[PDB]
Amino acid sequence: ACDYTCGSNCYSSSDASTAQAAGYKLHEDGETVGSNSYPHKYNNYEGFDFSVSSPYYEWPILSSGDVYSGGSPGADRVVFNENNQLAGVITHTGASGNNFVECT
Ligand SMILES: Nc1nc2c(ncn2[C@@H]2O[C@H](CO)[C@@H](O)[C@H]2OP(=O)(O)O)c(=O)[nH]1
Numbered sequence: 001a002c003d004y005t006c007g008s009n010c011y012s013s014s015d016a017s018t019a020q021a022a023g024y025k026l027h028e029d030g031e032t033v034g035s036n037s038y039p040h041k042y043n044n045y046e047g048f049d050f051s052v053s054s055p056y057y058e059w060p061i062l063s064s065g066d067v068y069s070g071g072s073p074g075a076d077r078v079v080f081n082e083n084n085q086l087a088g089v090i091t092h093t094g095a096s097g098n099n100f101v102e103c104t
């Protein structure tokens with residue numbers, strides 16, 4: 001079973017932790033990758049009720065299982081905070097335009 005289901009993509013907690021670790025490391029070093037400059041601030045326009053405090057940052061999580069290193073980010077993202085705590089996993093899949101819905 002999937003710990004996180006983003007549309008048709010299946011992720012385990014380990015997939016989320018691996019992606020998060022990479023994203024946090026780049027955040028800490030002040031570097032970015034990709035045309036959208038990941039990781040970058042997640043404003044939470046959606047108003048999701050995360051249990052951890054902001055600021056939030058988003059980083060792509062890939063269905064291939066690899067860590068994002070550039071190129072197309074896909075529709076899924078892991079969201080973490082300044083304390084390297086996981087806020088949640090979200091996706092553009094099933095959401096209109098550039099909005100996000102949570103993966104369940
Ligand atoms: N939907 C959404 N987009 C966000 C949020 N925070 C930042 N963004 C960025 O705001 C712009 C419009 O949605 C995009 O550049 C988007 O970046 P990403 O496309 O990388 O998510 C957020 O809380 N929700």
Ligand SMILES: [Sr+2]
Pocket residue numbers: 010011012015065
């Ligand atoms: Sr996996």
